[model samples]
Target chain A: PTSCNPSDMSHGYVTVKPRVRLHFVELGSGPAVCLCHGFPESWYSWRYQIPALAQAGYRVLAMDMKGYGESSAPPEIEEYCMEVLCKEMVTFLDKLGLSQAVFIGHDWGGMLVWYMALFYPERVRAVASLNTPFIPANPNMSPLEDYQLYFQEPGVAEAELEQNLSRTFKSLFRASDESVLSGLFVNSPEEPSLSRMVTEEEIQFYVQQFKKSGFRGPLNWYRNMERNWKWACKSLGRKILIPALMVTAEKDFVLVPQMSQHMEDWIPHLKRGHIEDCGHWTQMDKPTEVNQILIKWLDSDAR
Target chain B: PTSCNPSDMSHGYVTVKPRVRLHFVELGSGPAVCLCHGFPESWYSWRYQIPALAQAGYRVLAMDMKGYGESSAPPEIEEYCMEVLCKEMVTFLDKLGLSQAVFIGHDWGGMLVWYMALFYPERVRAVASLNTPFIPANPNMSPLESFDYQLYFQEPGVAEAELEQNLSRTFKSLFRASDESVLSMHKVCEAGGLFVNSPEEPSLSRMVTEEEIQFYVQQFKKSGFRGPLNWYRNMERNWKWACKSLGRKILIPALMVTAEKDFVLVPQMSQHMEDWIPHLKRGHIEDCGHWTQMDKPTEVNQILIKWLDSDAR
Candidate 1:
């Protein structure tokens, strides 16, 4: 059973449509601030930011994206396409009576927000992303071709993440120690540490969420990357007009800081902030600093 | 033996002046939002709002107002005057590198913010008051006559002795969530000239957890109630000082959140607030008693956030 208890700080499920039920915790009340968590994470990814932003005076909503938490998890890979995700976001706003809101995201959540702004700019008031930079779609090749070359199998990454959930979580979510940082790789790491980054309580929460929901729905997000690319290709050569802030972690393994080189050219109003000695979990690793940067930029006149 | 525990929510002390060492809990970073607690309350009064406001994007500072908690408690009744309190506020802002901030207060803390806005308009960007309303001082009469509780608090060693006799019972009596038993102690004060012992009853609401109540008990045990009662002792002085700004209006953006069931500070008391505060926003939280923020935090937070954002523009 989903932990949809009202006593849990206004945590419950909201059905935007018959097919979609998003589990969320809404706090405070004012201008809307929506948060989307990334791959292998639920709305719990934003536990720290929710209270902070809500207390600061924004009506904060941290939702488990489709197929992640209590939200609908369709088996079809096409259901996880960028177009469908973007539509769900628009419907989400409509259901909540929010004309527009500042959208914040991390990891795959970050990629979704970036795409949402690109595909449906009017719905997004502004965007703040953690550890994920906007990577313009490649006109020549599909994302599947690159993934096939790198991952070597259709469900290899998912298998790795699901086989020994504990070991996989421990391996993937560790702080960037000497062993992990020393590795030099074009697409993958040479050597990595298997230390646990989060507390046992947090790990247990994730483990429980994954155990009930399974990994197939979340894995479908990656499976639909090629379809998302095909659709996003049309958005190429177009700059995102909305105000944006991108925070890059110094020690992030996958989303290297160098990937954000030409983002300023594509995003005219983009503000770049950095978190030092931090990994992909930038918001969790240095929440205070990330919150500062986000609040300053979000509340600034530039937006 | 002050409980200067550093591990307690980034707690520390800062010297604003030679006479004042304000103990405060600082969190988050950005524009400053200074929180002031009411009479008989410490910085811990803002435990709920501190992390919320700090996380939202403000540098949240909930200070142990002078004469309460670990802050310096000057023996002179003159030091507890509104003028001195306002000066301490300005000096606190200066020490924290904040020329101005959004000031928020509850109970007597609410009364102080209104006075601060009137006297030192330059230091307050905006102000938000919970429960307390702007009752401009009448220079012609003593302030104690208006509120019966103020008179009861002014009698030295009267209220203090009653409260210190059983700190836990005293706290349980004061922090209520409904008006059913509100002002019941005022009658006790009227009959016995001070509050006497009564059997412990369950708190009117569950807003305050047992752990939190224990924390409050431990804090008040260390710091006696005399320093806090001294605030009431300065009523005449505060009244005299406030008369200077009697005709003035609070020009800064303001928010007044009223608890409908608050026994003393009734919601209707704020009906004419707009006449005094030109840019004022008003809200009412129902089924809540004197402790509006704690009783209905979600509603209070909503009202606060709406006003803060709307007023910012």
Candidate 2:
């Protein structure tokens, strides 16, 4: 469940309803800072940022979206499509009775924040993405053939993956604790050295959230990646026009500096921040700078 | 939560009270079987047993213990003492206003049913234990020393005695699956297992109840062995007081059992049952150990229902 002061009941949190009873924790009372956490995290992901954002004179709301902590998980994967997720963002705004507000997403939530601007530009004042690039609906992309490769070539990668899910995931999750910065996908000669890219506190935060419902629901996102692509393909191209900010981690293996190469074509008023000595979880790795950029962007005439 | 058939608002069941509650699943109105699950398990542990017992025309009342499932976890671990557990069973009866029940326990629940017969002999017409043995309280002995030694010492004289005497009980509960199960004893022996027993290599105790085991584990995650080992320290003190308080041997018609191939406790321990237990009935299953009720539920139930018939008759 999202943590609230409980004594401060009139300022609500964790409201439930029929179609979508979103779980969210709201703090402070100024221009709203609607913070969205990424994969393998909950609203608790913003424990550090909540007080900081609130103290900086902004209404902070961190939400555990549908299929997340204390939020409803209807057994339909279609409900998780970008259309529904985007609608939920506007509905969140409508429920807050705000005409428009700055929207931010980290990881997949960052992807959604960008999608919200693309679909309903009227509802978003500014957009921020942490460690995720907004990939516009493009038809020319190669069908993500990772799983397809497994079906065709049945020997090495699939065998290694099946035999080493626990070890691989454990290594991925526990790397931060081992004081080594190794990952599974790096193209090196020796089998990837066992190391951690995330901090121990960050790894533990992920572990605690995983322990709540584990990755069964979250991993459904990956498994349904093809379905999301299929749906996105059918819909005509949509564009994002918000005053956009993209924060890229210099060391993130998934998101290289080149991923943001043509982001200007997709986001009309784009602002980019690139941080060295940072990885996939850029905000967690360099929060003080990320927060500074966010607060500054919130106050700037760009919105 | 205990599985209910949705037919509520009845006097026969659905009774709720402070410090106690009554939960029963009634079907076919013939004989009755009250299945009490051991640690790390809920009433759902008998999800298989419930149908089999119901098919035999019996009402089965399976309860999640206090501190487990929907039942309350009183903030104190001291409430977890055997007496409090024993009271839950009686207060369960008091809520139902039933005079008696046929008691069955597996693992710690197994050990508890044995004591239940001692505390309220009249209430239990017959008893059955799965992977748990009735360990009579020893005054001169320290159970802490005994259990720890069995866990640590490689050579098995002082350690083996307590284990050997209770061999029929211990071996029935060890997990046979090594993959899902970690063979941590070898690691503990090498890494120096925690506690006073850390001097010698120790075998991890087979988790009787995974959630109960989880409670211990989660506590260990935070406080690491102090609260748990403190439980062990009370063992000898418990034995001295228990011996004084519990005067009679279990006189109820009881079913004692062991898995034939249990590596930890050999089948030879069955021979000593006649000497130690008065009016003891026995059974042994092949290729099973420590988790008899779970591993071989069909055979376990057949023997139990048959004996229950003869005893009630």
Candidate 3:
């Protein structure tokens, strides 16, 4: 297991409830801005923007979501449901005395932030997301069912991603064109992985973290997609009332920008933009630009 | 004198005829992409981009223009005229054996590249500028009358002495996120002349690290501000020359990255650009100040790479 170092960040763990301790890094001191990472990613995903935001005179809190990084990972897949994830974020703020805060999230974390604004509106001051867009629950089928039909079997995706974690990271982290990315989810790769956008050292850091944490915990997030679907069904007609900003990447294959087309239609107070030539890892790929957009949107009277 | 380390960059000096040897830092080897930095900055301004662009399969060349960094500083104010500056860019490309290349510039460098697109269209493949816009010079009025800072810069020994006095502080104050409070500090309040008093503490911008600030300080301490100020001294000369192309619109594929918070180069300034440049892709980096490339490198790079990739095909 990777140990939290004081030199890198202010290291600590918060016990939200029974058998749960979420590891986090906090910097600067002002109105809090909480950062949440997606599946298979640690708080380290927000490394670039954390210092930038903190220096910009705002308290920046980046936490390792349960089932990833130094956080507690329960064996049960039900524990990884969206309801539990959203509660953890609310509790994370309450535990720290943050009445309301601007929340920024990427990927699966983006889904949770959207739910946070929907279910617990008072907890979030503003919402900003990278790559991931809020697509309301489709009553016809659960996400797991959709994945099982269109994607792979229930546990197949987990196995494919978990098989040779280093190779999986190499394939996922690299910059990709439409040709390579189009076949990413539907058709598995036959060719060797191309050059990565991040440095080898960065890839190694991720590889090391995953090796220690194990991929099974993160995979449970995907396994509980059906549970999340039912939980979200109740709030089906509800629109996100808070001021929101969605940043979509042009080249992201997994979380396509087209999925967020009807976002503004449902979200009354929404501001959206795009990052060109970027992939799924929008925050990691273009940190300065991402930080600039977040800072600009948060500083504005959007709240 | 600051020495160029090969490890940091493929550093060297190129003698672009007319007795001017421009200093530059180059990286990678592919289709060339030239980077031009603005006033009070060196080729180091593109520090974050060189490696990134180079990795994206482009030979990135960031130059220390006429008076900045290790480049030769001309003594005559007239030597820094638009005609001379534009020619140096064309000649720099020619000397390097690059038949045509995409050029990216910020601030004063942005103005120069716009001029390149207008005058030496054959030499430029595509153009991308940050913060600065292409404002055609009016035959009716001098450029100094149009811009407050230019008028102030042209006053011999005034701006140079003030700016060079506290190099670190001057740099610190200039490099910051665009905010109303920061603007109010520099705006004409009860205080006189741009700034009431320079803050001795370091800048609030995380963009420029402390070591980078010292590098800028060292370069300015050695070169002084005469050559850089001379760029503004020839505004009248540039205006007269610019009027010759009043009807000529830049026909190249162009990209303009506007900084949202830049007080002087406000986002609205780019309103009229689409009228002239038919093939223009506009990008806005929100909460950024005058130093758009440095302030938000990742966004700028993504925009540039996307545009450059399209242009290449």
Candidate 4:
């Protein structure tokens, strides 16, 4: 299930927004489905799922989102907000003649697709969010009070992440309990043996891509914590009134399964499940289970 | 007024915050006055005011704001917030055994001192701001929409690359003395960038001789603009911290010195400041640019000396 298509898949770039170009890898042919990967993870994050979803008779476009591999990494913080990013995704679909398509996301990508469901509900055929739930902007939640403050600064977190790219990626993928990426790299400096989930070559692939397009653009996403909070003045109380599927990771540190406990309240048409032996990087950690969760939901979701 | 003291001023560095060492040039002896200079400018920005204020029987310390001059340029944006900057100044006063002193600011420093008054009103004897007015945080407003030069600066390496290309040209482009109405930052983005991308290149400002420009260039050449730009990048974050003040007024006597020709921090921006600030005194420099201290040093110095004795006393 983890094996990827060598001949059928192809990579390309499109100017989704002015001065912003996104790189995406496309596979198979059927109902158009766009795969949105999370922070620090490029389109390649959906490597296993792309082939599996393609095998299940669906065209999968795994995008290297803005500020990721081979994509235009805008330096400003506002450039990476939900409004612009959703607009970029819609424009991407427009260029590719994707009038309507399913948007499936993991981690940050999951958060993005959830926003997409609310922002442009008509354009989305359906949404499947893995490891991330639809959490609305709580104006009371101080952005300063969270671990995200670590990533809000320009060049601060990236300096640490970029210095040891592999170590950072290695820690991110292996994170299990609590908000502890800093713990993964800082507490455990000596690189642990590759997790049973991913190969060393996969980590190297992420390292090579991030090296080409440094972490500054990717980290810019975190700086928008407040702007995104403010933009939700338009979107705070509104429900994600669309067909949605949420896949939670049981052992995930950051987006723990408990985070999705109340998805039934917000997402009216929602189906939920969890992968047992997975960390934050659910799709990569348990591809077969993620594939089964996604394809089965897609096959059954007659909406 | 432009000529500084030959040996009357002594330069030193003090560790004010955790791992943050601020450099300062100290002069004269009387009532303590701590001068907080603005963005991109250093302790050197107060070269004109330092001597005059010192000569008027006052101990004047023009310390380089954090991220400028020989201060610790922390790479984090949060490290340069009003909270940290205010804490740094308070700690700086603590190190000197001075309980409280008049805190005066220009441009970005003006904004800082206002926050200082709100955050640690007890530590400040008085407050005086040149060019920039006390703008309380508007709960709805985000600085991203208006601060175009700052927005241009938010891009990490881009501005540094542009400004650092020719250190001489960068300072020359910025430190202008003419009262000519230049492009506001909104126009700055419309015309690409403020300095390098402008069609009409500006000459050296009248306030500084070639020697002074060289001195400024030398300081920036070492410090770079990334840390200085970090000050602008915190515009939104500063507002979040400003919200902590929550409708607080400056109970201490405050003075606002506005520049007539300064299109950016215009005299009108200082209007109705008395609403939020009590015992407010105002001064206007008739032919001053954004660089208020250098452009009209005599008038600014006169206003300062008068206020320190009368209103701020």
- The CA-based lDDT of model 2 is what? 0.56
Task: Report the Cα lDDT for candidate 1.
Answer: 0.72
What are the Cα lDDT values of the candidates? 0.72, 0.56, 0.74, 0.77
Instruction: Give the higher-DockQ candidate: 1 or 4.
Output: 1
Q: Write the per-residue lDDT of candidate 1 for residues B1-313, one digit (tens) a residue.
A: 0122223354445565677677776654455677889878878877667656654556567878887877888667677777888888887665443557888899889988998888888989899999999876788897666655566787777877877887776777677667534345465545763344444564533566666666677878766787788877887788888887788888899989898888788988888888878998888888988877677877776677677667742
- Select the stronger candidate by lDDT from 1 and 4: 4
| Interface DockQ of each model | 0.02, 0.01, 0.01, 0.01
Candidate 2, CAPRI quality class derived from DockQ: incorrect
lDDT tens readout by residue for model 3, A155-245: 5666666666666676667674523433134465644354555656666677777766576677777666677788888896798898899
**Model 1 residue-pair collision total:** 3
Compared with the true structure, model 1 gives a TM-score of 0.51
TM-score of 2: 0.41
- Model 4: runs farther than 4 Å from truth? A1-303, B5-8, B145-147, B180-184, B196-202
Worst 10 residues of 3 chain B by lDDT: B1-10
Q: Give the 10-residue window scoring lowest on summed lDDT in candidate 2 chain A.
A: A1-10
Top candidate on TM-score is 1
Worst 10 residues of 2 chain B by lDDT: B3-12
Encode model 3's per-residue lDDT on B229-279: one tens digit a residue.
898788778888899888989889999888888877787888899989999
The residue pairs found clashing in candidate 3 are none
Kindly give the number of clashing pairs for every candidate: 3, 17, 0, 0
> How large a fraction of the reference contact set does each model reproduce?
0.00, 0.00, 0.00, 0.00
In model 4, the clashing pairs are none
